[PDB]
Amino acid sequence: HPVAFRCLDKLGLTVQSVKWDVGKDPQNTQVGDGGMSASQRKALQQILQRPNPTMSGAQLRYSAALSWACFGRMAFKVSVMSDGSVNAIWPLGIPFLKQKFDRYGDVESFQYGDEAGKETIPSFTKVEKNDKGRPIKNYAFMIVKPSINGAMNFDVQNTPLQAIGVPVALYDALMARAIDSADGTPNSKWLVTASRDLDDGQAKEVKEGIEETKPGGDNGGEIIFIAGTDVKVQEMKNDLSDIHSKVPLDDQARTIAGNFGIPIALLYDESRKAFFEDTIEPGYLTPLEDGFSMFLCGAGYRVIFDRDSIPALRKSRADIAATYDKVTFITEEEKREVTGWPA
Amino acid sequence: PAPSANPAKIFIRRFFSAGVAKNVVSYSNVMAAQRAMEHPVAFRCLDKLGLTVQSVKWDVGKDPQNTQVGDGGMSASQRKALQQILQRPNPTMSGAQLRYSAALSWACFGRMAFKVSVMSDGSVNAIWPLGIPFLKQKFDRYGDVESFQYGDEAGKETIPSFTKVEKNDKGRPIKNYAFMIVKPSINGAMNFDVQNTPLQAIGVPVALYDALMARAIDSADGTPNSKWLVTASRDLDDGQAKEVKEGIEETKPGGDNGGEIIFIAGTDVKVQEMKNDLSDIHSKVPLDDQARTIAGNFGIPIALLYDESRKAFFEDTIEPGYLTPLEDGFSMFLCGAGYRVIFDRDSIPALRKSRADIAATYDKVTFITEEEKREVTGWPA
Amino acid sequence: EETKPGGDNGGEIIFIAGTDVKVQEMKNDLSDIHSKVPLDDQARTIAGNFGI
């Protein structure tokens, strides 16, 4: 679908532009840092910039966010070698991913494939752990978007596709009507008519008289003289200028574009700022980063992405930094931390 | 390190089959891409997209996130050769045209393919782009591609993939290979899935546009362009009815009595002036909408067909949809860690004012060391 | 019929000798199916009530 695909690849594209890195977390009360080895952290950085071969970090981000938008879930796979050192990461196709629950409240394993592929990959909650807490064998994530009635995983998905069926169907119907009527409505004008008293043998001649005035005709552009037997011409309109129903179409476009959280103007700069820091950041950037930080590294360190890598927010960051520079009742470190710049 | 067992083995079971050399794109997709290159709006947007990225300048450079103190710039001479080949690819083709063809195929099919000729020591000798329509690839047993077939009967060079090839000790290859950069999609299937191109979603508008334009060209020639449908009576002694016709006719510009009145003595002729509007033959309203739609789907602000819009098109559609995947693909397998291919943003003529301003403002700041004020605006060290 | 785009003689006039046939062009407005005015107002009401 044109509009849905446009919005989807837009959302996937923008998030695919952000840059990763592992780093110290700001709310580090945990003096007993969970960066267990500080060599596991370097390897996690490497994999975070270079996932499983023939796949880059950007494409990983793109697929992750795209699945997140379509189904409201994110699934992955890690291959930690033996010592909390992750080997590489794979994204999981949400369509054909099944999961299996425990007796108390949660998932234990994920089944991926029908009959042949049956790798009952353990969940993070149950897997062979280190003496520090880190896993030793493979696992998966299944990041989930909450909904009403709790039901943390047993619940129904929470995706925009829930509430856009009506407008997308309306759009399809209207565009089908337009396509059909484009070819099928005669494109001719001047429905001329004679009477039953004209000796067809010259009504051929009257036709050749009217017809042969086309641009580049024998007598083209000259008048029509009909001596006797008044023939009557009527000009059809053939408006054909609203076949797609322009008004009850842009409304559906605004509906299925707004439901993805896209300021219409995108399809001025202020609206780009809004789309970046209103729906993209706290709807794709924060959930993915909290999902990774929850179980990909110990406390005190977590995956972070540089806000200054967004080309649209550079001017805003620069102005805010400049203004703060003028303040004085504030130490240098908090002037730093209030605008990134950890220490 | 490498575990050789990815979870991508769902598809080789039954959903696919190994040792078959499947082609990479549907014939429908190829023919759609072909005639979309002759359509006015689609070709305009395609060549704009190619032209813009074709503009960026290449170079290899230190990567910023160089946590690998064991730099993968194995030789520092392979890197000079990579610079050379990056500015001068295979003879009879330049780097700019390489970028043009790569990005154009990326836009049309969502795939990129290439070929290298590393001599014996990680020094790549030349780089060739591969025609996506007639490139077929052959998969391994676990989850991935091993070899590429290029040509049906005579050309049968099953060039090895990068994953499986004779790789010099450090890891760098020794013999030729190919890339097959792919665009991600739903339901994973990183290589087994369908293409992801703007052409998927503009068949409807492009067909509607062709329908309207055919109607326009059609009605242009065929609708009489004459006025004054004059008829006399059926009682006029034709022999003077011709005379009245000559009287009316010979008022054309450059005639006997042009511009003077017409006197008819009895037998009232009856003229009626036809409109011949013909001022909506192409249906302007349900045409520019299709132009906007097949323009919006390629990721192009309409206004381009003000400077704020150029900036947006550059740092919103060109960069994170053509520049970063291409550069990350080259970086993944063309050089070792710590080094990768980078392009200078300040080579974009549209961003120069923005860069200068952001550089100026940061200069006013004080609670930031010099190196970070540099790195936040390029300028590595 | 044979004047549709991609027709044998498409775009030329129609000549009917005798027995006047009569065509009428259907308006087919269809541009207010959703009742744009008494719909955006409901959107505003169920929006303003959420305080947005």
PDB file of C-alpha atoms in Angstrom, chain B residues 92-353:
ATOM      1  CA  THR B  92      36.893   2.632 -18.091  1.00  0.00           C
ATOM      2  CA  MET B  93      34.749   3.532 -15.059  1.00  0.00           C
ATOM      3  CA  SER B  94      35.141   6.095 -12.278  1.00  0.00           C
ATOM      4  CA  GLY B  95      34.152   6.134  -8.632  1.00  0.00           C
ATOM      5  CA  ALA B  96      31.346   8.615  -9.210  1.00  0.00           C
ATOM      6  CA  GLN B  97      29.723   6.375 -11.810  1.00  0.00           C
ATOM      7  CA  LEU B  98      30.231   3.477  -9.414  1.00  0.00           C
ATOM      8  CA  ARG B  99      28.223   5.348  -6.786  1.00  0.00           C
ATOM      9  CA  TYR B 100      25.634   6.252  -9.420  1.00  0.00           C
ATOM     10  CA  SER B 101      25.044   2.684 -10.595  1.00  0.00           C
ATOM     11  CA  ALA B 102      25.159   1.274  -7.063  1.00  0.00           C
ATOM     12  CA  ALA B 103      22.598   3.726  -5.729  1.00  0.00           C
ATOM     13  CA  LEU B 104      20.380   3.468  -8.803  1.00  0.00           C
ATOM     14  CA  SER B 105      20.195  -0.308  -8.466  1.00  0.00           C
ATOM     15  CA  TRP B 106      19.652   0.144  -4.728  1.00  0.00           C
ATOM     16  CA  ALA B 107      16.676   2.360  -5.489  1.00  0.00           C
ATOM     17  CA  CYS B 108      15.171   0.164  -8.190  1.00  0.00           C
ATOM     18  CA  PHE B 109      15.667  -3.294  -6.657  1.00  0.00           C
ATOM     19  CA  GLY B 110      16.827  -2.686  -3.095  1.00  0.00           C
ATOM     20  CA  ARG B 111      19.967  -4.693  -3.841  1.00  0.00           C
ATOM     21  CA  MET B 112      23.616  -3.882  -4.502  1.00  0.00           C
ATOM     22  CA  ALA B 113      26.185  -6.232  -6.013  1.00  0.00           C
ATOM     23  CA  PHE B 114      29.874  -5.846  -6.806  1.00  0.00           C
ATOM     24  CA  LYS B 115      33.051  -7.790  -7.503  1.00  0.00           C
ATOM     25  CA  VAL B 116      36.665  -7.386  -6.375  1.00  0.00           C
ATOM     26  CA  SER B 117      39.991  -8.819  -7.543  1.00  0.00           C
ATOM     27  CA  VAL B 118      42.295  -8.906  -4.495  1.00  0.00           C
ATOM     28  CA  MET B 119      45.736  -9.838  -5.819  1.00  0.00           C
ATOM     29  CA  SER B 120      47.348 -12.013  -3.135  1.00  0.00           C
ATOM     30  CA  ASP B 121      47.743  -9.937   0.031  1.00  0.00           C
ATOM     31  CA  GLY B 122      44.504  -8.102   0.738  1.00  0.00           C
ATOM     32  CA  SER B 123      45.334  -5.510  -1.935  1.00  0.00           C
ATOM     33  CA  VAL B 124      42.110  -5.246  -3.930  1.00  0.00           C
ATOM     34  CA  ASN B 125      42.891  -4.837  -7.620  1.00  0.00           C
ATOM     35  CA  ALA B 126      39.585  -3.627  -9.077  1.00  0.00           C
ATOM     36  CA  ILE B 127      35.871  -3.339  -8.350  1.00  0.00           C
ATOM     37  CA  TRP B 128      32.988  -4.015 -10.738  1.00  0.00           C
ATOM     38  CA  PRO B 129      29.241  -3.501 -10.287  1.00  0.00           C
ATOM     39  CA  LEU B 130      27.000  -6.459 -11.062  1.00  0.00           C
ATOM     40  CA  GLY B 131      23.799  -6.302 -13.065  1.00  0.00           C
ATOM     41  CA  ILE B 132      21.131  -7.224 -10.533  1.00  0.00           C
ATOM     42  CA  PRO B 133      18.451  -8.433 -13.020  1.00  0.00           C
ATOM     43  CA  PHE B 134      20.617 -11.307 -14.304  1.00  0.00           C
ATOM     44  CA  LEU B 135      22.563 -12.174 -11.152  1.00  0.00           C
ATOM     45  CA  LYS B 136      21.690 -15.487  -9.512  1.00  0.00           C
ATOM     46  CA  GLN B 137      22.938 -16.691  -6.143  1.00  0.00           C
ATOM     47  CA  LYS B 138      23.388 -20.132  -4.628  1.00  0.00           C
ATOM     48  CA  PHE B 139      22.939 -20.931  -0.952  1.00  0.00           C
ATOM     49  CA  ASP B 140      24.771 -23.118   1.549  1.00  0.00           C
ATOM     50  CA  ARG B 141      23.121 -25.695   3.791  1.00  0.00           C
ATOM     51  CA  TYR B 142      22.976 -23.780   7.074  1.00  0.00           C
ATOM     52  CA  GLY B 143      21.551 -20.345   6.353  1.00  0.00           C
ATOM     53  CA  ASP B 144      23.339 -18.319   3.719  1.00  0.00           C
ATOM     54  CA  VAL B 145      24.758 -17.801   0.241  1.00  0.00           C
ATOM     55  CA  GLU B 146      28.013 -19.382  -0.867  1.00  0.00           C
ATOM     56  CA  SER B 147      28.395 -18.520  -4.558  1.00  0.00           C
ATOM     57  CA  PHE B 148      27.001 -16.234  -7.244  1.00  0.00           C
ATOM     58  CA  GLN B 149      26.057 -17.288 -10.753  1.00  0.00           C
ATOM     59  CA  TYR B 150      26.301 -14.516 -13.339  1.00  0.00           C
ATOM     60  CA  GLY B 151      25.001 -15.425 -16.776  1.00  0.00           C
ATOM     61  CA  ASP B 152      22.882 -18.307 -18.022  1.00  0.00           C
ATOM     62  CA  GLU B 153      24.991 -20.525 -20.287  1.00  0.00           C
ATOM     63  CA  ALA B 154      28.462 -19.251 -21.328  1.00  0.00           C
ATOM     64  CA  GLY B 155      29.329 -17.063 -18.326  1.00  0.00           C
ATOM     65  CA  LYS B 156      29.157 -19.402 -15.356  1.00  0.00           C
ATOM     66  CA  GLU B 157      31.679 -17.941 -12.950  1.00  0.00           C
ATOM     67  CA  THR B 158      30.403 -19.050  -9.576  1.00  0.00           C
ATOM     68  CA  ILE B 159      32.308 -16.274  -7.849  1.00  0.00           C
ATOM     69  CA  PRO B 160      32.590 -17.246  -4.169  1.00  0.00           C
ATOM     70  CA  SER B 161      30.796 -15.216  -1.543  1.00  0.00           C
ATOM     71  CA  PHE B 162      32.705 -13.286   1.084  1.00  0.00           C
ATOM     72  CA  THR B 163      31.723 -15.694   3.862  1.00  0.00           C
ATOM     73  CA  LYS B 164      33.409 -18.645   2.118  1.00  0.00           C
ATOM     74  CA  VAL B 165      36.658 -17.754   0.337  1.00  0.00           C
ATOM     75  CA  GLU B 166      40.379 -18.352   0.795  1.00  0.00           C
ATOM     76  CA  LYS B 167      41.101 -15.803   3.498  1.00  0.00           C
ATOM     77  CA  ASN B 168      44.685 -14.822   4.252  1.00  0.00           C
ATOM     78  CA  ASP B 169      45.783 -15.611   7.781  1.00  0.00           C
ATOM     79  CA  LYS B 170      44.581 -12.381   9.367  1.00  0.00           C
ATOM     80  CA  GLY B 171      41.154 -12.954   7.804  1.00  0.00           C
ATOM     81  CA  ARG B 172      41.377 -10.956   4.587  1.00  0.00           C
ATOM     82  CA  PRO B 173      40.482 -12.822   1.369  1.00  0.00           C
ATOM     83  CA  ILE B 174      42.955 -13.777  -1.329  1.00  0.00           C
ATOM     84  CA  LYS B 175      40.682 -14.490  -4.327  1.00  0.00           C
ATOM     85  CA  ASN B 176      37.736 -12.742  -5.936  1.00  0.00           C
ATOM     86  CA  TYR B 177      34.281 -12.470  -4.358  1.00  0.00           C
ATOM     87  CA  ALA B 178      31.035 -10.469  -4.380  1.00  0.00           C
ATOM     88  CA  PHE B 179      28.903  -8.577  -1.848  1.00  0.00           C
ATOM     89  CA  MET B 180      25.145  -8.710  -2.555  1.00  0.00           C
ATOM     90  CA  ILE B 181      24.127  -5.954  -0.186  1.00  0.00           C
ATOM     91  CA  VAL B 182      20.460  -6.483   0.688  1.00  0.00           C
ATOM     92  CA  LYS B 183      17.703  -4.337   2.221  1.00  0.00           C
ATOM     93  CA  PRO B 184      15.873  -5.697   5.291  1.00  0.00           C
ATOM     94  CA  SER B 185      12.156  -6.400   5.392  1.00  0.00           C
ATOM     95  CA  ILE B 186       9.433  -8.029   7.487  1.00  0.00           C
ATOM     96  CA  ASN B 187       9.528 -11.703   8.564  1.00  0.00           C
ATOM     97  CA  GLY B 188      13.325 -11.646   8.403  1.00  0.00           C
ATOM     98  CA  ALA B 189      14.573 -14.056   5.730  1.00  0.00           C
ATOM     99  CA  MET B 190      17.626 -11.820   5.421  1.00  0.00           C
ATOM    100  CA  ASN B 191      18.378 -13.136   1.941  1.00  0.00           C
ATOM    101  CA  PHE B 192      15.391 -15.387   1.216  1.00  0.00           C
ATOM    102  CA  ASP B 193      12.813 -12.613   1.592  1.00  0.00           C
ATOM    103  CA  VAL B 194      11.242 -10.377  -1.026  1.00  0.00           C
ATOM    104  CA  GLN B 195      12.726  -7.149  -2.325  1.00  0.00           C
ATOM    105  CA  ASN B 196      11.965  -3.825  -0.614  1.00  0.00           C
ATOM    106  CA  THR B 197      11.728  -1.068  -3.217  1.00  0.00           C
ATOM    107  CA  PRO B 198       9.578   2.013  -3.819  1.00  0.00           C
ATOM    108  CA  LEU B 199       8.425   0.327  -7.033  1.00  0.00           C
ATOM    109  CA  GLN B 200       6.284  -2.077  -4.988  1.00  0.00           C
ATOM    110  CA  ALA B 201       3.803   0.633  -4.074  1.00  0.00           C
ATOM    111  CA  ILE B 202       3.448   2.886  -7.112  1.00  0.00           C
ATOM    112  CA  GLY B 203       2.056   0.520  -9.727  1.00  0.00           C
ATOM    113  CA  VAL B 204      -1.395   1.986  -9.122  1.00  0.00           C
ATOM    114  CA  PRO B 205      -0.374   5.653  -9.540  1.00  0.00           C
ATOM    115  CA  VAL B 206       1.981   5.032 -12.444  1.00  0.00           C
ATOM    116  CA  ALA B 207      -0.757   3.140 -14.287  1.00  0.00           C
ATOM    117  CA  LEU B 208      -3.285   5.877 -13.552  1.00  0.00           C
ATOM    118  CA  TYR B 209      -0.822   8.475 -14.829  1.00  0.00           C
ATOM    119  CA  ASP B 210      -0.326   6.550 -18.057  1.00  0.00           C
ATOM    120  CA  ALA B 211      -4.083   6.216 -18.478  1.00  0.00           C
ATOM    121  CA  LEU B 212      -4.633   9.954 -18.108  1.00  0.00           C
ATOM    122  CA  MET B 213      -1.740  10.908 -20.371  1.00  0.00           C
ATOM    123  CA  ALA B 214      -2.919   8.503 -23.054  1.00  0.00           C
ATOM    124  CA  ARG B 215      -6.360  10.075 -22.837  1.00  0.00           C
ATOM    125  CA  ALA B 216      -4.763  13.505 -23.201  1.00  0.00           C
ATOM    126  CA  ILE B 217      -2.614  12.708 -26.243  1.00  0.00           C
ATOM    127  CA  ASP B 218      -5.598  10.905 -27.745  1.00  0.00           C
ATOM    128  CA  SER B 219      -8.085  13.734 -27.337  1.00  0.00           C
ATOM    129  CA  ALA B 220      -5.568  16.341 -28.475  1.00  0.00           C
ATOM    130  CA  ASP B 221      -5.800  15.105 -32.071  1.00  0.00           C
ATOM    131  CA  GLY B 222      -9.320  14.016 -32.937  1.00  0.00           C
ATOM    132  CA  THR B 223     -11.516  16.665 -31.374  1.00  0.00           C
ATOM    133  CA  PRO B 224     -12.448  19.244 -34.038  1.00  0.00           C
ATOM    134  CA  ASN B 225     -10.820  22.603 -33.368  1.00  0.00           C
ATOM    135  CA  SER B 226     -13.293  24.603 -35.464  1.00  0.00           C
ATOM    136  CA  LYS B 227     -15.936  27.075 -34.308  1.00  0.00           C
ATOM    137  CA  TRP B 228     -19.039  28.604 -35.899  1.00  0.00           C
ATOM    138  CA  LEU B 229     -21.074  25.535 -36.761  1.00  0.00           C
ATOM    139  CA  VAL B 230     -23.167  27.444 -39.299  1.00  0.00           C
ATOM    140  CA  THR B 231     -26.064  25.849 -41.161  1.00  0.00           C
ATOM    141  CA  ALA B 232     -28.246  27.411 -43.812  1.00  0.00           C
ATOM    142  CA  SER B 233     -31.733  26.280 -44.765  1.00  0.00           C
ATOM    143  CA  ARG B 234     -32.842  23.357 -46.893  1.00  0.00           C
ATOM    144  CA  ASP B 235     -34.068  25.774 -49.523  1.00  0.00           C
ATOM    145  CA  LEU B 236     -31.253  27.923 -50.795  1.00  0.00           C
ATOM    146  CA  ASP B 237     -30.323  27.057 -54.405  1.00  0.00           C
ATOM    147  CA  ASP B 238     -26.805  25.716 -53.821  1.00  0.00           C
ATOM    148  CA  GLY B 239     -24.988  27.941 -56.220  1.00  0.00           C
ATOM    149  CA  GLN B 240     -25.678  30.846 -53.950  1.00  0.00           C
ATOM    150  CA  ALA B 241     -25.290  28.888 -50.701  1.00  0.00           C
ATOM    151  CA  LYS B 242     -21.741  28.439 -51.816  1.00  0.00           C
ATOM    152  CA  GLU B 243     -21.724  32.179 -52.280  1.00  0.00           C
ATOM    153  CA  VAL B 244     -22.762  32.801 -48.681  1.00  0.00           C
ATOM    154  CA  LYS B 245     -20.090  30.372 -47.490  1.00  0.00           C
ATOM    155  CA  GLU B 246     -17.431  32.261 -49.425  1.00  0.00           C
ATOM    156  CA  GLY B 247     -18.816  35.475 -47.955  1.00  0.00           C
ATOM    157  CA  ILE B 248     -18.378  34.162 -44.413  1.00  0.00           C
ATOM    158  CA  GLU B 249     -15.098  32.378 -45.134  1.00  0.00           C
ATOM    159  CA  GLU B 250     -13.318  35.271 -46.797  1.00  0.00           C
ATOM    160  CA  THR B 251     -13.155  37.169 -43.535  1.00  0.00           C
ATOM    161  CA  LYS B 252     -10.151  35.197 -42.317  1.00  0.00           C
ATOM    162  CA  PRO B 253      -7.119  37.311 -41.426  1.00  0.00           C
ATOM    163  CA  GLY B 254      -5.656  38.124 -44.813  1.00  0.00           C
ATOM    164  CA  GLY B 255      -8.768  37.868 -46.955  1.00  0.00           C
ATOM    165  CA  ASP B 256     -10.774  39.935 -49.399  1.00  0.00           C
ATOM    166  CA  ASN B 257     -13.260  41.452 -46.953  1.00  0.00           C
ATOM    167  CA  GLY B 258     -11.754  40.449 -43.636  1.00  0.00           C
ATOM    168  CA  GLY B 259     -13.146  42.062 -40.528  1.00  0.00           C
ATOM    169  CA  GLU B 260     -16.190  43.602 -42.179  1.00  0.00           C
ATOM    170  CA  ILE B 261     -19.788  42.708 -41.431  1.00  0.00           C
ATOM    171  CA  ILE B 262     -21.750  39.928 -43.124  1.00  0.00           C
ATOM    172  CA  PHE B 263     -24.888  41.012 -44.957  1.00  0.00           C
ATOM    173  CA  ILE B 264     -27.482  38.321 -45.673  1.00  0.00           C
ATOM    174  CA  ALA B 265     -30.605  39.351 -47.536  1.00  0.00           C
ATOM    175  CA  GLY B 266     -33.190  36.860 -46.289  1.00  0.00           C
ATOM    176  CA  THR B 267     -33.049  33.086 -45.716  1.00  0.00           C
ATOM    177  CA  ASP B 268     -31.593  33.528 -42.252  1.00  0.00           C
ATOM    178  CA  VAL B 269     -28.552  31.371 -41.641  1.00  0.00           C
ATOM    179  CA  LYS B 270     -28.098  30.240 -38.056  1.00  0.00           C
ATOM    180  CA  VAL B 271     -24.605  30.193 -36.601  1.00  0.00           C
ATOM    181  CA  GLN B 272     -23.773  28.825 -33.182  1.00  0.00           C
ATOM    182  CA  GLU B 273     -20.369  29.257 -31.592  1.00  0.00           C
ATOM    183  CA  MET B 274     -18.881  26.062 -30.212  1.00  0.00           C
ATOM    184  CA  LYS B 275     -16.929  26.264 -26.973  1.00  0.00           C
ATOM    185  CA  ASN B 276     -14.221  23.641 -27.524  1.00  0.00           C
ATOM    186  CA  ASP B 277     -12.994  24.027 -23.958  1.00  0.00           C
ATOM    187  CA  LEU B 278     -10.224  21.409 -24.197  1.00  0.00           C
ATOM    188  CA  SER B 279      -8.601  23.011 -21.129  1.00  0.00           C
ATOM    189  CA  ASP B 280      -8.736  19.945 -18.890  1.00  0.00           C
ATOM    190  CA  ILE B 281      -7.804  17.154 -21.310  1.00  0.00           C
ATOM    191  CA  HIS B 282      -5.119  15.795 -19.006  1.00  0.00           C
ATOM    192  CA  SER B 283      -7.222  16.153 -15.827  1.00  0.00           C
ATOM    193  CA  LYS B 284      -4.756  18.332 -13.942  1.00  0.00           C
ATOM    194  CA  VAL B 285      -6.263  17.604 -10.540  1.00  0.00           C
ATOM    195  CA  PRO B 286      -6.171  13.776 -10.648  1.00  0.00           C
ATOM    196  CA  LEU B 287      -2.720  13.930 -12.231  1.00  0.00           C
ATOM    197  CA  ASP B 288      -0.585  16.074  -9.956  1.00  0.00           C
ATOM    198  CA  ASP B 289      -1.843  13.891  -7.119  1.00  0.00           C
ATOM    199  CA  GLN B 290      -0.331  10.832  -8.792  1.00  0.00           C
ATOM    200  CA  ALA B 291       2.825  12.840  -9.449  1.00  0.00           C
ATOM    201  CA  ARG B 292       2.990  13.679  -5.739  1.00  0.00           C
ATOM    202  CA  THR B 293       2.373  10.086  -4.697  1.00  0.00           C
ATOM    203  CA  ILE B 294       5.010   8.541  -6.970  1.00  0.00           C
ATOM    204  CA  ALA B 295       7.239  11.417  -5.888  1.00  0.00           C
ATOM    205  CA  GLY B 296       6.566  10.971  -2.183  1.00  0.00           C
ATOM    206  CA  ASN B 297       7.196   7.233  -2.280  1.00  0.00           C
ATOM    207  CA  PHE B 298      10.759   7.735  -3.498  1.00  0.00           C
ATOM    208  CA  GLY B 299      11.277  10.056  -0.530  1.00  0.00           C
ATOM    209  CA  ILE B 300      11.353  13.456  -2.220  1.00  0.00           C
ATOM    210  CA  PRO B 301       9.795  16.687  -0.922  1.00  0.00           C
ATOM    211  CA  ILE B 302       7.342  17.848  -3.578  1.00  0.00           C
ATOM    212  CA  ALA B 303       8.674  21.413  -3.674  1.00  0.00           C
ATOM    213  CA  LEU B 304      11.819  20.181  -5.433  1.00  0.00           C
ATOM    214  CA  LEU B 305       9.682  19.543  -8.527  1.00  0.00           C
ATOM    215  CA  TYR B 306      12.820  26.456  -0.272  1.00  0.00           C
ATOM    216  CA  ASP B 307      16.397  25.721   0.755  1.00  0.00           C
ATOM    217  CA  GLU B 308      14.948  24.162   3.905  1.00  0.00           C
ATOM    218  CA  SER B 309      13.406  21.556   1.626  1.00  0.00           C
ATOM    219  CA  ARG B 310      16.780  20.885  -0.008  1.00  0.00           C
ATOM    220  CA  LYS B 311      18.372  20.443   3.411  1.00  0.00           C
ATOM    221  CA  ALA B 312      15.577  18.064   4.377  1.00  0.00           C
ATOM    222  CA  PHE B 313      15.917  16.012   1.202  1.00  0.00           C
ATOM    223  CA  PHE B 314      19.655  15.743   1.814  1.00  0.00           C
ATOM    224  CA  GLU B 315      19.727  14.838   5.512  1.00  0.00           C
ATOM    225  CA  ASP B 316      16.451  12.901   5.600  1.00  0.00           C
ATOM    226  CA  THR B 317      16.165  10.805   2.434  1.00  0.00           C
ATOM    227  CA  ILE B 318      19.512  10.723   0.652  1.00  0.00           C
ATOM    228  CA  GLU B 319      21.768  10.195   3.656  1.00  0.00           C
ATOM    229  CA  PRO B 320      20.037   7.577   5.829  1.00  0.00           C
ATOM    230  CA  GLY B 321      18.626   5.692   2.867  1.00  0.00           C
ATOM    231  CA  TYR B 322      21.489   5.604   0.405  1.00  0.00           C
ATOM    232  CA  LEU B 323      24.669   6.817   2.067  1.00  0.00           C
ATOM    233  CA  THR B 324      24.744   4.980   5.393  1.00  0.00           C
ATOM    234  CA  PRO B 325      23.732   1.505   4.100  1.00  0.00           C
ATOM    235  CA  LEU B 326      26.200   1.696   1.214  1.00  0.00           C
ATOM    236  CA  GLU B 327      29.026   2.898   3.446  1.00  0.00           C
ATOM    237  CA  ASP B 328      28.219   0.343   6.136  1.00  0.00           C
ATOM    238  CA  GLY B 329      28.113  -2.440   3.558  1.00  0.00           C
ATOM    239  CA  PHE B 330      31.499  -1.499   2.150  1.00  0.00           C
ATOM    240  CA  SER B 331      32.839  -1.137   5.687  1.00  0.00           C
ATOM    241  CA  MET B 332      31.547  -4.554   6.775  1.00  0.00           C
ATOM    242  CA  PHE B 333      33.690  -6.452   4.267  1.00  0.00           C
ATOM    243  CA  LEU B 334      36.257  -4.339   2.506  1.00  0.00           C
ATOM    244  CA  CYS B 335      38.710  -3.531   5.330  1.00  0.00           C
ATOM    245  CA  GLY B 336      39.644  -4.584   8.835  1.00  0.00           C
ATOM    246  CA  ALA B 337      38.399  -3.111  12.083  1.00  0.00           C
ATOM    247  CA  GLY B 338      39.435   0.367  13.154  1.00  0.00           C
ATOM    248  CA  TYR B 339      39.299   1.488   9.518  1.00  0.00           C
ATOM    249  CA  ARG B 340      36.323   1.857   7.214  1.00  0.00           C
ATOM    250  CA  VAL B 341      35.055   3.852   4.266  1.00  0.00           C
ATOM    251  CA  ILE B 342      33.764   7.344   5.080  1.00  0.00           C
ATOM    252  CA  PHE B 343      32.461  10.238   2.995  1.00  0.00           C
ATOM    253  CA  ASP B 344      32.912  13.926   3.817  1.00  0.00           C
ATOM    254  CA  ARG B 345      29.597  15.637   4.551  1.00  0.00           C
ATOM    255  CA  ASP B 346      31.151  19.051   3.900  1.00  0.00           C
ATOM    256  CA  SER B 347      31.402  17.980   0.262  1.00  0.00           C
ATOM    257  CA  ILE B 348      27.628  18.483   0.126  1.00  0.00           C
ATOM    258  CA  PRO B 349      27.090  22.042  -1.167  1.00  0.00           C
ATOM    259  CA  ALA B 350      23.672  22.295   0.508  1.00  0.00           C
ATOM    260  CA  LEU B 351      24.859  21.756   4.095  1.00  0.00           C
ATOM    261  CA  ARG B 352      27.779  24.202   4.105  1.00  0.00           C
ATOM    262  CA  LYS B 353      25.910  27.059   5.794  1.00  0.00           C
TER     263      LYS B 353
END
